Design a protein around this nucleic acid. Structure first.
Lengths: 123, 129, 205, 80, 6, 82, 150
RNA sequence: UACCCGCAGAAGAAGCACCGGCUAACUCCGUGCCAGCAGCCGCGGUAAUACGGAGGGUGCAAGCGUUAAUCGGAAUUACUGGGCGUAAAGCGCACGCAGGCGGUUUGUUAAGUCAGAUGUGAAAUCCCCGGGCUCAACCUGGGAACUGCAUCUGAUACUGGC
RNA sequence: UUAGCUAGUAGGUGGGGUAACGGCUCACCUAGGCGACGAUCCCUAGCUGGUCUGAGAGGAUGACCAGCCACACUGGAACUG
């Protein structure tokens, strides 16, 4: 409102909160992967979404989504998580990178293989 | 409260021409006249009048044209709550120029367009459109 | 870093002739031009304010063989440049040596006008210019490489060349093969289905 | 002169330890309003002259005690 | 119109 | 020892020194007092190749100041008054 | 010099007994390219019928705006309901730089420049309104003589 | 080495994301609320341009995508530039210290304020006009700028003090 | 959701000291000194030129390059010059 007021208690910015805080605010992280489960999403949709509870490197343990039809993951493994949430499964704020570390890319995927990690099959 | 007599002029005037009247009066103040003069000279009001002796009274003859009045708008810039002063080049120009902006200088009041060429500068009383 | 593919497929999307398959019989046609830029060309593309705005430049690029990563900078350039940035971008787009080549008929297409400027077969006030991007100032005179002069190709080009609209800011020759940059192209002596602002905007958002 | 300065006391009690204050209109760097910003300078007082409240002239000079680098020059007015 | 909570 | 020398402000292979009055001790491109000309070891037979405020260099030498030996090769390879 | 194009087209409702009835509303603007601009709303149970009806009011009601070489003079700012809007002139810095919906009413009216920005609501219907009434009040420059010269 | 001249021959060199909307860009098949997509809305329960594949198309190119981070858009802390009857928002009300602000006229002060000048504000960077590497990046000449501070000589309407 | 902080502490005088002024040190003496324009206390952090973003005012940042500073196993000390 008033200048005098702004002069006194000055206007204060409101910091932002990284939707993904699996620390360092850094590209991706390595994690041991505690369990490999499958769950059900919100009311509108109904699948058997695949997920894994991963013990990151920085100590935070967190649940991550496994994108693509099928995966090699299980018990131990060592995926590397990324970012981007999964608006359908709450709590799932991270996606494990496919075809990274102990994670196998989606078998046979031919479209947009950059994700789901796969290599050009016989050009 | 009484704190500001200047924004009382601009307001009474902006309000007077609002209620399409021809004359508006208010107690007289030296600076007020200085401004009055400005508006006259610049053709924003037909003219002033000051028939005040013991209790100085000031009247302003309002102008008009077609389906509107002369002053499309008039705002107070520097106020007692936040004074504003400007250099020679920092002097503000109203409506790409089509409109004065009363600036008081150490050598008597003026108009933005005036003071500019004048070479000096000072506090800017208000904005008249 | 060049197109290298169905070039008509392009001019069919722009619905105009981009001076691509110039060569012998100028004035295109013969390929289905219009009614099928793809597998649904038949359709009526009722495009958005965006479409009739991206397609504008998506054209300008092609009507010269220039790319994005680089086109931008041209715009950024023109921007700093005083005056209608629209005509300016054009002024710089035309000012391209790969263009002054073709434009001076020293080569069929603006595509065939590269394979050489690239394969050192041209030059300026001396020094052979290897980069098909050189920016030709005023007076700057080119000259097909005194070396592989008039060959089993470039000759057949000048033919249709001088029988084309013909520029106005260059004083080409014919056997002496060596035009000049008389002056920078004004706005009045160049245009057609090309809008400035319509593109100067796309880069304002 | 070699840079003169006006200022008002702060205390009479101090024995050769006379401190002062300096007002200065200053335009806040963002909101533009004009703020009063003070500066307190400890000053040298030989034979402890000029009492409290008084207004005085000061000069920047050589150190004389842990943080005390100014000496009076002239006293102006004595009732405030 | 509205999902996951509304 | 305020020695007038050159700093390598060129670019891979294409240097470009710069005569400058500076406290002998500092780094090459380290703190200095005032550029006082330059030196272009390229240029190619055209217009320029070197510049020096000769009537300034003297002002320094005047307050005692040793000159580089590669800086001296410039103070004269370009004459003095002819 | 027709010069006419639509801005937006929304589908509304009228919830009755056996369900709801959807109508359609189109907002369109027209002008020439030298002052004079106008807009018209209009709705009809049919898509075209609406837009067709849109040009009708569009034709009628066309205020005369006082440009300058293809731009504006004193920079201006107009308001209507929830949208506050402002506009700066200058020699075609690029060519009509303003927001969608608020743009057309700038093209058709004939101003290949202006740097604009829409604040407040960005609902087409009220910004086109704000803008028009923004160009409107824009007083006479080369005819300042009104209150000017005197 | 940079560079210059031949030798040979298209030989030796293209990928990635995307196509329901925002957002440029379509279909078939499979599939069946399964499998899976998703940045937001939102797609899938038999004929789905939103899933996977194929065809096709679109946009970028030695890259393309994703994740991460900052500013922008966000007039979404609003000084420029926002608000509070019901949308989030006027202290339950009142007195009042500090502070903020203050009617009117003259004289004076000249601090604020203002104009000219002089120091200074490294260089580099950004910017303006040129130069040089084939161009450009890069390199470089000169200039403007560094919106600031201090000192002094003026100004006096307005503001402050007397 | 830190409001009070300080005895060499604040000043004086007087010896000693330093390259030099100086509480630097000591002795004596007045009793002060700083603080809500935010001291003190916590948490964080190398500072500037600039860098990124922005129409701008600003927001963010200070790797590479240059100026200033600081440290060089941790803590402490002097010596040489």
């Amino acid at each position: 409102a008033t200048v005098n007021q702004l002069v006194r208690k000055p206007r204060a910015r409101k910091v932002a909160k990284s939707n993904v805080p699996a620390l360092e605010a850094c590209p991706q992280k390595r994690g041991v992967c505690t369990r490999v489960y499958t769950t059900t999403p919100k009311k509108p949709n109904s699948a058997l979404r695949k997920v894994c509870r991963v013990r990151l490197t920085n100590g935070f343990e967190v649940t991550s989504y496994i994108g693509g039809e099928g995966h090699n993951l299980q018990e131990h493994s060592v995926i590397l998580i990324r970012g981007g949430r999964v608006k359908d499964l709450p709590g799932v704020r991270y996606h494990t990178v496919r075809g990274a570390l102990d994670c196998s890319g989606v078998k046979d995927r031919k479209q947009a293989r950059s994700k789901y990690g796969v290599k050009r099959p016989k050009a | 409260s009484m704190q500001d007599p200047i924004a009382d002029m601009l307001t009474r005037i902006r309000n007077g021409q609002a209620a399409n009247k021809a004359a508006v009066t208010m107690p007289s103040s030296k600076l007020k006249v200085a401004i009055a003069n400005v508006l006259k000279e610049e053709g924003f009001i037909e003219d002033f009048k000051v028939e005040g002796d013991t209790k100085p009274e000031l009247e302003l003859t309002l102008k008009y044209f077609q389906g509107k009045a002369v002053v499309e708008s008039i705002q107070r810039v520097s106020r007692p709550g936040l004074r504003i002063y400007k250099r020679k080049d920092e002097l503000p120009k109203v409506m790409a120029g089509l409109g004065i902006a009363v600036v008081s200088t150490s050598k008597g009041v003026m108009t933005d367009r005036a003071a500019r060429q004048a070479g000096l500068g000072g506090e800017i009383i208000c904005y008249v459109a | 870093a060049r197109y290298l593919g169905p070039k008509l497929k392009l001019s069919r999307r722009e619905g105009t002739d981009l001076f691509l398959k110039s060569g012998v019989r100028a004035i295109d046609t013969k390929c289905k031009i219009e009614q099928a830029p793809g597998q649904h060309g038949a359709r009526k593309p009722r495009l958005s304010d965006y479409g009739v705005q991206l397609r504008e430049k998506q054209k300008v690029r092609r009507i010269y063989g220039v790319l994005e990563r680089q086109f931008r900078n041209y715009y950024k350039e023109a921007a700093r440049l005083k005056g209608n940035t629209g005509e300016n971008l054009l002024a710089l787009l035309e000012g391209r040596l790969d263009n002054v080549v073709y434009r001076m008929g020293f080569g069929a297409t603006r595509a065939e006008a590269r394979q050489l400027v690239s394969h050192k077969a041209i030059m300026v006030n001396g020094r052979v210019v290897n980069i098909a991007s050189y920016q030709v100032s005023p007076n700057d005179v080119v000259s097909i490489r005194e070396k592989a002069k008039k060959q089993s190709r470039v000759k057949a080009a000048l033919e249709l060349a001088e029988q084309r609209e013909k520029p106005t800011w260059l004083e080409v020759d014919a056997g002496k093969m060596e035009g000049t940059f008389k002056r920078k192209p004004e706005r009045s002596d160049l245009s057609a289905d090309i809008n400035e602002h319509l593109i100067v905007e796309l880069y304002s958002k | 002169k070699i840079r003169t300065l006006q200022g008002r006391v702060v205390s009479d009690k101090m024995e050769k330890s006379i401190v002062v204050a300096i007002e200065r209109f200053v335009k806040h760097p963002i909101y533009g309003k004009f703020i009063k910003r003070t500066t307190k300078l400890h000053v040298h007082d030989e034979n402890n002259e000029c009492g409290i409240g008084d207004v005085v002239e000061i000069r920047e000079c050589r150190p004389l005690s842990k943080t005390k680098s100014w000496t009076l020059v002239r006293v102006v007015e004595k009732a405030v | 119109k509205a999902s996951s909570x509304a | 020892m305020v020695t007038i020398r050159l700093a390598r402000h060129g670019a891979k292979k294409r240097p470009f020194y710069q005569v400058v009055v500076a406290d002998s001790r500092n780094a090459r491109n380290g703190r200095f007092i005032e550029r006082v000309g330059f030196f272009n070891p390229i240029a190619s037979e055209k217009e320029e190749g070197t510049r020096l405020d000769l009537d300034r260099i003297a002002h320094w030498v005047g307050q005692g100041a040793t000159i580089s030996d590669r800086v001296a090769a410039l103070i004269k390879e370009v004459n003095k008054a002819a | 010099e027709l010069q006419e194009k639509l801005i937006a087209v929304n589908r509304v409702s009228k919830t009755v007994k056996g369900g709801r009835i959807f109508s359609f509303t189109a907002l369109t603007v027209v002008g020439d390219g030298n002052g004079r601009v106008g807009f018209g709303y209009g709705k009809a149970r049919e898509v075209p019928a609406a837009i067709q009806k849109a040009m009708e009011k569009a034709r009628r009601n066309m205020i005369n705006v006082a440009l300058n070489n293809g731009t504006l003079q004193h920079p201006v700012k107009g308001v209507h309901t929830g949208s506050r809007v402002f506009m700066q002139p200058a020699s075609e810095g690029t060519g009509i730089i303003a927001g969608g919906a608020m743009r057309a009413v700038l093209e058709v009216a004939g101003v290949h420049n202006v740097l604009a920005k829409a604040y407040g609501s960005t609902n087409p219907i009220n910004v086109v309104r704000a803008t028009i009434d923004g160009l409107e009040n824009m007083n006479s420059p080369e005819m300042v003589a009104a209150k000017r010269g005197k």
